[PDB]
Design a protein around this ligand. Structure first.
Ligand SMILES: CC(C)CCC[C@@H](C)[C@H]1CC[C@H]2[C@@H]3CC=C4C[C@@H](O)CC[C@]4(C)[C@H]3CC[C@]12C
Ligand SMILES: CC(C)CCC[C@@H](C)[C@H]1CC[C@H]2[C@@H]3CC=C4C[C@@H](O)CC[C@]4(C)[C@H]3CC[C@]12C
Lengths: 313, 313
């Protein structure tokens, strides 16, 4: 028929012109928003730069004799520090340039959430993803280790591990760009773990490979488990957002982390001893011996430093 | 001293309060922009849905007898099609949800450029990145093939290839989300090439591995070169943004692509023949034989289809 469909088409035309009017409207608003945003970011970067120059100059002029009321200078210094903090939390609400690593993978993209709700929801989704992939990883590890599939599934498991670590690197860099305090060591931890898994992947079937696959699968399984536990603790802590229960839980969780660290060290040691005895594949055995050692070293060092920093309270 | 630095601090305070006022201002504008954007996208999705329902209903009621002035119905159909196009190009200016793949790697990020200039600049940067990494790849290929380093550098070259193909997958998906017509086959081409390079990486040193490394490095080198040439042609074409020179250049470039395709086929065939004769590592040789064949099949098929589509003009 024609009449019913034509009349519905007319109603559609009305709603069409309405939507078109509104969409044509907000183009100008979007333009003005981008303009003002650009102006604001340029200005704040300029002012922060000049403020830092003032800070350096005054710090150099600072150590002079305190015979005068230089306590006022200390107050001015507190003021500079709080100004830096204000500029910081203000600019966190404003989009930034990627940096180096993200520019290499994505490049010239304005990946910067601009709402506390959206930012927090994204971080929560990130942790949930880490948990789910940890479950998948532990089930594949259990299948490969005990269920007697020692032919290929180790290759697939290693592919999964390397993809996991690369995508966690990317999400970690996005989180750093959006703002967090994880810029210390872990972004390199993920790199070195990726390298270790790759080297272990190149490793072709010899004989010692059996002993080492046994140790390595068992340890990776245990680390996946402790990863699950750490996720649950940190998700409980975020849902809390108290302090006493948090500190008690961290004290309960620290021994497992130290046990994992020293397991890493013992694995590296048995790897050295194995590479000492007559055995080919020295390339792979030694270039997979180095990581475990370095990874343990950095991990234990950072954990000791952070627990001392916390207890310093 | 105190006076000079304090007076400069006062000027800094003035500019500080100014910047603070402007930044506190544009918060509300940002809020209203997000609100209006959400309203607009919800409304347009709703209206597009209902329009599609109308389209289905009228298409089903359409094949009735044309004894009446059903040419008006054909005009209404043209109107529906142009309405779909209008909704399309309008919504392209408006941010979208990631989809499936990007949600798996990044997740809940509003990666959608909102300016023709920014979008075009990003696409150009993408092509320039492809070129630069192609140069790096061809130089590493030349070093590995002829310069007699047939021990490890093949592993490093393969790591580079797999990282290249994964990051091109990500950039390709971002480009599809931002809007392009490359949703046909290539997003799966990159996947299958990644799989092939991985399988070739697992391959441990036998004897036939020598013959196959020779053929494979030579072919990968040639494909890198033709990739460079295709980049230069397409960058010239975009800088043009004529048609006659474009068609002549594509006609000049087609034979190289067909030669590469048939080289792929011949490589797959020699791989089958090699796997036929007594030789272990059947896992790797055959699971690396399948890709070349399938990849050639899809590539040649798509190239024939697209050249026929173009000549159809
Ligand atoms: C104070 C410090 C020195 C205490 C260190 C205790 C360490 C050495 C103990 C505690 C946990 C133990 C490890 C538990 C699990 C494994 C995995 C197994 O496949 C090999 C033995 C190995 C690796 C053990 C080695 C010894 C070990 C690491
Ligand atoms: C009409 C069409 C099918 C003719 C196709 C002819 C093709 C198959 C011929 C012409 C050029 C030949 C190639 C010349 C160079 C090389 C590089 C060498 O390292 C492997 C063999 C290889 C790859 C040859 C394979 C077969 C080849 C590609």
């Amino acid at each position: 028929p024609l009449g019913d469909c034509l009349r519905d088409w007319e109603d559609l035309q009305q709603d069409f012109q309405n939507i078109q009017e509104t969409h044509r409207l907000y183009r100008l608003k979007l333009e003005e928003l981008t303009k003002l945003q650009n102006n604001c970011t340029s200005s704040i970067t300029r002012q922060k730069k000049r403020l830092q120059e003032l800070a350096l100059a005054l710090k150099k002029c600072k150590p002079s004799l305190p015979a005068e009321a230089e306590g006022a200078a200390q107050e001015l210094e507190n003021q500079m520090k709080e100004r830096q903090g204000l500029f910081f939390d203000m600019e966190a609400y404003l989009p930034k340039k990627n940096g180096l690593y993200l520019s290499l993978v994505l490049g010239n993209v304005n990946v910067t959430l601009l709402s506390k709700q959206a930012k927090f929801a994204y971080k929560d989704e990130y942790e949930k993803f880490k948990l789910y992939l940890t479950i998948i990883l532990i089930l594949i590890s259990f299948t490969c280790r005990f269920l007697l599939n020692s032919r290929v599934t180790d290759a697939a498991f290693n592919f999964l591990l390397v993809w996991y670590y690369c995508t966690l690197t990317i999400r970690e860099s996005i989180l750093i760009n959006n703002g967090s305090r994880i810029k210390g060591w872990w972004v390199f931890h993920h790199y070195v773990s990726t390298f270790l898994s790759g080297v272990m992947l190149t490793w072709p079937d010899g004989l010692m490979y059996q002993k080492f696959r046994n140790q390595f699968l068992s340890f990776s399984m245990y680390q996946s488990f402790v990863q699950f536990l750490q996720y649950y603790y940190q998700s409980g802590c975020l849902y809390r957002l108290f302090q006493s229960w948090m500190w008690r839980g961290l004290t309960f969780l620290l021994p497992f982390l130290f046990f994992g660290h020293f397991w890493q060290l013992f694995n590296a040691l048995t790897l050295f001893n194995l590479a000492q005895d007559p055995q080919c594949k020295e390339w792979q055995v030694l270039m997979c011996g180095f990581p475990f050692l370095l990874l343990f070293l950095g991990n234990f060092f950072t954990t000791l430093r952070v627990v001392h920093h916390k207890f310093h309270s």
